Design an enzyme around this catalytic site. Sequence first.
Site, PDB file in Angstrom:
ATOM      1  N   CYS A 120      23.624  -3.653  17.545  1.00  0.00           N
ATOM      2  CA  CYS A 120      23.791  -2.234  17.269  1.00  0.00           C
ATOM      3  C   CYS A 120      24.410  -1.428  18.402  1.00  0.00           C
ATOM      4  CB  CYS A 120      22.450  -1.608  16.878  1.00  0.00           C
ATOM      5  SG  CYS A 120      21.883  -2.196  15.286  1.00  0.00           S
ATOM      6  N   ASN A 143       9.434  -8.162   4.907  1.00  0.00           N
ATOM      7  CA  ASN A 143       9.016  -6.954   5.620  1.00  0.00           C
ATOM      8  C   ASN A 143      10.137  -6.185   6.322  1.00  0.00           C
ATOM      9  OD1 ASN A 143       9.369  -8.810   7.652  1.00  0.00           O
ATOM     10  ND2 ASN A 143       7.562  -8.186   8.831  1.00  0.00           N
ATOM     11  N   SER A 147      20.282  -5.516  19.904  1.00  0.00           N
ATOM     12  CA  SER A 147      19.482  -6.707  20.172  1.00  0.00           C
ATOM     13  C   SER A 147      20.315  -7.771  20.869  1.00  0.00           C
ATOM     14  CB  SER A 147      18.930  -7.273  18.873  1.00  0.00           C
ATOM     15  OG  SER A 147      17.895  -6.440  18.350  1.00  0.00           O
ATOM     16  N   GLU A 203       0.825  -1.204   0.000  1.00  0.00           N
ATOM     17  CA  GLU A 203       0.000   0.000   0.000  1.00  0.00           C
ATOM     18  C   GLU A 203       0.861   1.257   0.000  1.00  0.00           C
ATOM     19  N   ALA A 204       0.454   2.260  -0.773  1.00  0.00           N
ATOM     20  CA  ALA A 204       1.178   3.523  -0.791  1.00  0.00           C
ATOM     21  C   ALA A 204       1.289   4.085   0.621  1.00  0.00           C
ATOM     22  CB  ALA A 204       0.484   4.534  -1.712  1.00  0.00           C
ATOM     23  N   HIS A 223      19.109   5.255  18.921  1.00  0.00           N
ATOM     24  CA  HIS A 223      19.303   4.267  17.875  1.00  0.00           C
ATOM     25  C   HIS A 223      18.001   4.209  17.060  1.00  0.00           C
ATOM     26  CE1 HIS A 223      20.093   0.807  15.525  1.00  0.00           C
ATOM     27  NE2 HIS A 223      19.056   0.165  16.035  1.00  0.00           N
ATOM     28  N   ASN A 275      18.727   2.327   8.522  1.00  0.00           N
ATOM     29  CA  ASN A 275      19.347   1.820   9.742  1.00  0.00           C
ATOM     30  C   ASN A 275      20.770   1.385   9.417  1.00  0.00           C
ATOM     31  OD1 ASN A 275      19.999   0.535  12.157  1.00  0.00           O
ATOM     32  ND2 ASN A 275      18.323  -0.974  12.070  1.00  0.00           N
ATOM     33  N   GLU A 298      28.682  -4.937  13.898  1.00  0.00           N
ATOM     34  CA  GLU A 298      28.135  -6.289  13.916  1.00  0.00           C
ATOM     35  C   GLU A 298      28.214  -6.906  12.529  1.00  0.00           C
ATOM     36  OE1 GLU A 298      23.821  -6.877  13.427  1.00  0.00           O
ATOM     37  OE2 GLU A 298      23.643  -4.965  14.521  1.00  0.00           O
TER      38      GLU A 298
HETATM   39  C1  LIG Z   1       9.675  -3.096  11.870  1.00  0.00           C
HETATM   40  C2  LIG Z   1       9.040  -4.281  11.215  1.00  0.00           C
HETATM   41  C3  LIG Z   1       8.638  -5.306  12.225  1.00  0.00           C
HETATM   42  C4  LIG Z   1       7.774  -3.838  10.467  1.00  0.00           C
HETATM   43  O1  LIG Z   1       7.242  -4.796   9.572  1.00  0.00           O
HETATM   44  P1  LIG Z   1       5.642  -5.030   9.487  1.00  0.00           P
HETATM   45  O2  LIG Z   1       5.132  -5.308  10.935  1.00  0.00           O
HETATM   46  O3  LIG Z   1       5.376  -6.252   8.641  1.00  0.00           O
HETATM   47  O4  LIG Z   1       4.875  -3.757   8.971  1.00  0.00           O
HETATM   48  P2  LIG Z   1       3.537  -3.387   9.719  1.00  0.00           P
HETATM   49  O5  LIG Z   1       2.373  -4.078   9.049  1.00  0.00           O
HETATM   50  O6  LIG Z   1       3.547  -3.733  11.250  1.00  0.00           O
HETATM   51  O7  LIG Z   1       3.435  -1.826   9.614  1.00  0.00           O
HETATM   52  C5  LIG Z   1       4.343  -1.069  10.368  1.00  0.00           C
HETATM   53  C6  LIG Z   1       3.841   0.350  10.486  1.00  0.00           C
HETATM   54  O8  LIG Z   1       3.351   0.918   9.173  1.00  0.00           O
HETATM   55  C7  LIG Z   1       1.932   1.232   9.349  1.00  0.00           C
HETATM   56  N1  LIG Z   1       1.264   1.139   8.029  1.00  0.00           N
HETATM   57  C8  LIG Z   1       0.970   0.002   7.307  1.00  0.00           C
HETATM   58  N2  LIG Z   1       0.413   0.405   6.046  1.00  0.00           N
HETATM   59  C9  LIG Z   1       0.382   1.868   6.002  1.00  0.00           C
HETATM   60  C10 LIG Z   1      -0.087   2.863   4.950  1.00  0.00           C
HETATM   61  N3  LIG Z   1      -0.618   2.393   3.702  1.00  0.00           N
HETATM   62  N4  LIG Z   1       0.011   4.170   5.185  1.00  0.00           N
HETATM   63  C11 LIG Z   1       0.549   4.655   6.409  1.00  0.00           C
HETATM   64  N5  LIG Z   1       0.997   3.709   7.426  1.00  0.00           N
HETATM   65  C12 LIG Z   1       0.896   2.334   7.182  1.00  0.00           C
HETATM   66  C13 LIG Z   1       1.474   0.328  10.440  1.00  0.00           C
HETATM   67  O9  LIG Z   1       0.161   0.354  10.856  1.00  0.00           O
HETATM   68  C14 LIG Z   1       2.600   0.544  11.427  1.00  0.00           C
HETATM   69  O10 LIG Z   1       2.591   1.681  12.213  1.00  0.00           O
HETATM   70  P3  LIG Z   1       1.789   1.719  13.550  1.00  0.00           P
HETATM   71  O11 LIG Z   1       0.261   1.625  13.244  1.00  0.00           O
HETATM   72  O12 LIG Z   1       2.204   0.553  14.415  1.00  0.00           O
HETATM   73  O13 LIG Z   1       2.093   3.083  14.252  1.00  0.00           O
HETATM   74  C15 LIG Z   1       9.996  -4.916  10.195  1.00  0.00           C
HETATM   75  O14 LIG Z   1      10.423  -4.018   9.222  1.00  0.00           O
HETATM   76  C16 LIG Z   1      11.215  -5.596  10.823  1.00  0.00           C
HETATM   77  O15 LIG Z   1      11.152  -6.668  11.430  1.00  0.00           O
HETATM   78  N6  LIG Z   1      12.451  -4.823  10.798  1.00  0.00           N
HETATM   79  C17 LIG Z   1      13.689  -5.350  11.398  1.00  0.00           C
HETATM   80  C18 LIG Z   1      13.690  -5.274  12.915  1.00  0.00           C
HETATM   81  C19 LIG Z   1      13.648  -3.877  13.512  1.00  0.00           C
HETATM   82  O16 LIG Z   1      14.010  -2.886  12.877  1.00  0.00           O
HETATM   83  N7  LIG Z   1      13.175  -3.726  14.861  1.00  0.00           N
HETATM   84  C20 LIG Z   1      13.365  -2.469  15.558  1.00  0.00           C
HETATM   85  C21 LIG Z   1      13.703  -2.637  17.024  1.00  0.00           C
HETATM   86  S1  LIG Z   1      15.145  -3.677  17.306  1.00  0.00           S
HETATM   87  C22 LIG Z   1      16.579  -2.639  17.027  1.00  0.00           C
HETATM   88  O17 LIG Z   1      16.402  -1.470  16.681  1.00  0.00           O
HETATM   89  C23 LIG Z   1      17.873  -3.387  16.734  1.00  0.00           C
HETATM   90  C24 LIG Z   1      18.175  -3.578  15.249  1.00  0.00           C
HETATM   91  C25 LIG Z   1      17.006  -4.042  14.408  1.00  0.00           C
HETATM   92  O18 LIG Z   1      18.817  -2.453  14.726  1.00  0.00           O
HETATM   93  C26 LIG Z   1      19.168  -4.787  15.185  1.00  0.00           C
HETATM   94  C27 LIG Z   1      20.447  -4.759  15.994  1.00  0.00           C
HETATM   95  O19 LIG Z   1      20.468  -4.306  17.289  1.00  0.00           O
HETATM   96  O20 LIG Z   1      21.463  -5.266  15.532  1.00  0.00           O
END
Ligand SMILES: CC(C)(COP(=O)([O-])OP(=O)([O-])OC[C@H]1O[C@@H](n2cnc3c(N)ncnc32)[C@H](O)[C@@H]1OP(=O)([O-])[O-])[C@@H](O)C(=O)NCCC(=O)NCCSC(=O)C[C@@](C)(O)CC(=O)[O-]
EC number: 2.3.3.10
Lengths: 460, 460
Positions: B118, B156, B366, B32-33, B253, B332, B84
Amino acid sequence: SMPKDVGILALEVYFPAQYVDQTDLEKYNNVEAGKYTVGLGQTRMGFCSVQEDINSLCLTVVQRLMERIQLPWDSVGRLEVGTETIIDKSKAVKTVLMELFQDSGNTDIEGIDTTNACYGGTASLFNAANWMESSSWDGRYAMVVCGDIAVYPSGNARPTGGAGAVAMLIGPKAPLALERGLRGTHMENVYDFYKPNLASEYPIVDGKLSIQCYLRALDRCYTSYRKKIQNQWKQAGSDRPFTLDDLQYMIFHTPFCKMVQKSLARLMFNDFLSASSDTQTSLYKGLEAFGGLKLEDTYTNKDLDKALLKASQDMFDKKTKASLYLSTHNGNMYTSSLYGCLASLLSHHSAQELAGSRIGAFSYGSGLAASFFSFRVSQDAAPGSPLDKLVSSTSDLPKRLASRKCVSPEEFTEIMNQREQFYHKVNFSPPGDTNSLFPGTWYLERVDEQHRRKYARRPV
Amino acid sequence: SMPKDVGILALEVYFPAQYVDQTDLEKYNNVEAGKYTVGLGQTRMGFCSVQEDINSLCLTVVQRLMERIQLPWDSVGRLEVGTETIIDKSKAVKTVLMELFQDSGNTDIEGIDTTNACYGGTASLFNAANWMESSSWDGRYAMVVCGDIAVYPSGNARPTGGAGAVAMLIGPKAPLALERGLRGTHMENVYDFYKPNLASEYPIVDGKLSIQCYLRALDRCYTSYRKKIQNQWKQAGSDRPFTLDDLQYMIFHTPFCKMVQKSLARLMFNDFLSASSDTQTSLYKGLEAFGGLKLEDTYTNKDLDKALLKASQDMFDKKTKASLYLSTHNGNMYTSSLYGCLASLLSHHSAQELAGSRIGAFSYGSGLAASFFSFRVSQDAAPGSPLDKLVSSTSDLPKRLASRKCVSPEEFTEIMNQREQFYHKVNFSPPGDTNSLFPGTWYLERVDEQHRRKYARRPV
Ligand SMILES: CC(C)(COP(=O)([O-])OP(=O)([O-])OC[C@H]1O[C@@H](n2cnc3c(N)ncnc32)[C@H](O)[C@@H]1OP(=O)([O-])[O-])[C@@H](O)C(=O)NCCC(=O)NCCSC(=O)C[C@@](C)(O)CC(=O)[O-]
Ligand SMILES: CC(C)(COP(=O)([O-])OP(=O)([O-])OC[C@H]1O[C@@H](n2cnc3c(N)ncnc32)[C@H](O)[C@@H]1OP(=O)([O-])[O-])[C@@H](O)C(=O)NCCC(=O)NCCSC(=O)C[C@@](C)(O)CC(=O)[O-]
């Protein structure tokens, strides 16, 4: 007010419950008798099955330390692991060690993991002392953990593996105090030993180059250390040069025992080449024939090598030989090798013998990073003193080594092959009778579908 | 005499010369956009071909820093890399960086690499300050380096990758001084994100769990930090509680921008739940309906989430929004993400605006390891002051970002696929026109038959 006499208060060593005998290994590998026992100076080599990994080694040594000294969970403010045994590219061993602390509510513990080959334990030690002397110290102990599983493929390096871990409690008023300002460090970019095959436990190693790099780093670090202590001495009104005579004991990262005998010899050659013409003639008569040679020549010139071994034999016997006991009986355990030598030193000598002495230490990691530094031992050797407690805690080291089980080279080889087979496996429980583990040993109980490792502990 | 105002004197950021546009990526992924540009808050994502690796990123940012400020080789006494992105299990990036120092004869440089997800950059920063304040400081600068290539498989998580590196010069009398004694740290054993598949660049990640763990760590670290600063305030004769009002800026972060908006909201909820009944009624009228809920509920309760975002909008706009510019335009970059936010903050504000302020900082990795800490900005914002120099050095960040080339999602995907294909390859030269690299960028010229990497540098 910086805390005084920061250093090692307590030390714990862990090694696996089985070894392969080097004489047996010679026969198995069809090499000349004595090639390993005399050529390398090695007697027995410890090894781990897939039932043990870097996490379980570190859990074991840390919990054993804490239980022995009844260390409160809330008394540790920094905890950091040095290792080169990597089973996760992001998740530090430190995080797994939090299993020992988090339930008690003590999670405000600085430190993570730190790696460069066999140098990480020393890096962690230096970081701990740095922290304790800084504005960030909060009065609590630091705990330095290092360990490794050192394995090579079948071939000329295999007899120089080993395994184990060490935990050290760092605090003020320590009986082994780091000598302040005396870190002779040298790092440079080399490819003597490295692990670029991410899915293999085995390093790429150029044996000859690794020996040359270790020795060059030793030269550089010893020179840096001497410059620094001489500068301190000068400020205190003394122009005398530092030599091996100023060290009562000298311990080394020990890839194999012969390497260390040659390394002490190399230090003597450095003393000789740095000495005045007068001192050369007076104290080094057997080396005068070589006054025009270079440090690097100790490796290529056989007459020089032999003369140095002869000239340094007494110093080796007095300062270094005892520290090699664990190494000759367990092998190279990489980051914790140097600290195993410290344990061996403590196990051999009485507190009264060690009291007031200087212990020199050389830490090397291929790649390379290296430091030469030293400890000053407390003058207090009375019964119940911190020094007496530390020394006494190591006295049973030979008995502990003797309690291990000898395994045939055939079965040892099968176990090594099994390490290769299981390296990447998921959804399995490592084979092996837990009764073959020492009491109190943590072990890998299962790797689940998602590659998550679960550990259990043999009672006691 | 411990040196005063230890902290950041200079900061350099590096990011690659190409990005994929998030709106384009939405259309490519048939989503979705606005899912990425609004849902995640992301605009453009930087990425690297196989021509760049963790070594080349770090060489680039370090040499660029040294050239810009004309840093003498002999002025650096500690150099340490947080990352990392592991391409060798034994040989540290620090050793490769010695290519920049060793020919000049300065090899006495403490530090190696340090890793947990991180968090490693922060670990290196803390280690540098600890060293500088310790008995081991020799008057020289420390250099903290961090960087990473953040990549995920198609799915995702892929839109939340990124790449880059940061180098910081640490010294006394710094315009961004670490606030002493104020490190709220929390570590625990979790499996939210980890890299146990040693031969894959990709982590195993539980997205929801990673978000929960980040936020729980934030709670714990903020509580620890507040306790520590309140204790300092009490000793100085003040019983007042610390809240977000006591921070002028707050940087995090940043795995993606929406996460950070929610994180600032989470901090406000913590202030609210910690506040007196009177304070709650006076300052948090919009939150009173939720006074009985838990911190964890900000993630599950939509009414609460919405109320917190609304209540914290002004604080977010003032304290945090500007710091997200690099993140929204690059993605990131793991260990250097937080420090890219610091760069963005400096790029947006004048020295006069920043002068005298407190900047709060939250670092997460993490697995997990986390710290909440802070900087005090110098009062001196005169032209040519250390603060002015630092701020000025970041002012062209948006221009630099704008000079990158936009790459189609199709070609971006091909390049990602190529990273998978070449991950383990030996005896090859990475494809790619070096003219597509920024001037002064180091790059991987060849991986030889022995898996040794050789680097070259694009002029300027
Ligand atoms: C972050 C996830 C989980 C998301 O992946 P997802 O869950 O599949 O996407 P979603 O369906 O949950 O949507 C996410 C957001 O977009 C919204 N949304 C949906 N559609 C629309 C639209 N059309 N228009 C406007 N907004 C829209 C949606 O509703 C939501 O916002 P919210 O409602 O919760 O406020 C995924 O990308 C992922 O797993 N990423 C990797 C992990 C990560 O970044 N986690 C962050 C915390 S951990 C950390 O930061 C450490 C890290 C990751 O750097 C690693 C390390 O330490 O080495
Ligand atoms: C050490 C090597 C190279 C040896 O591999 P090799 O091919 O057996 O070399 P060698 O043929 O010269 O044999 C070695 C010694 O045995 C002797 N010898 C031969 N036959 C007999 C006999 N019948 N009776 C008595 N002696 C005999 C022989 O003559 C010699 O002693 P020397 O003459 O040089 O004094 C190999 O095991 C290897 O590559 N090991 C791994 C690398 C290593 O341990 N290097 C040490 C320095 S690097 C370091 O310590 C870092 C490290 C390794 O821990 C890694 C890290 O930092 O992560």
